[PDB]
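Re: Re: ligand-bound prediction request (bumping)

Still looking for help on this. To restate: I need the protein modeled with NVF bound, output as structure tokens. Inputs repeated here so nobody has to scroll up.
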Amino acid sequence: SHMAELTPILPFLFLGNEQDAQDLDTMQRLNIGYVINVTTHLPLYHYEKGLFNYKRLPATDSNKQNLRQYFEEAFEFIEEAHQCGKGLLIHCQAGVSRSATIVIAYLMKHTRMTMTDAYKFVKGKRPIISPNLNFMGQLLEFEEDLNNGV
Ligand SMILES: CC(C)(C)C(=O)CSc1ncc2c(n1)-c1ccsc1CC2
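Reply:
Sorry for the wait, this slipped through. Here it is.
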């Protein structure tokens, strides 16, 4: 069977794929209470159990998907877990391309890392990340907006 590998980017921020998000035991052992689903078609796992607060970001893994519009909605959702001492799991699909894009944006926003330093930070903890030239460009546009105060 699949062994869940919830990569801890920060002690309260976890990242994974669709298979990593279906493991209920590890999520409770890691004290997560917030889940971010960055897909349009995947179900909110363990919704019928009333254990987590869910937020879905309806995004596709295409060359036209806009992920910048969902950054601030996810940052406040991650910050609401930070302020109450609980963990957050953000996940999408196999390549973890979408969910790692927001995590890099979060490390870029609240830790003041450069896009490469933030990318090298997440790449060292989860070595398998599918490339997406669209999301790379949106992260580059996001970095210069951070360097100019927006
Ligand atoms: C969408 C996402 C960023 C998660 C991705 O597509 C991972 S793949 C990749 N491979 C080589 C580089 C980079 N990303 C990168 C990222 C930012 S600056 C840079 C320069 C080398």
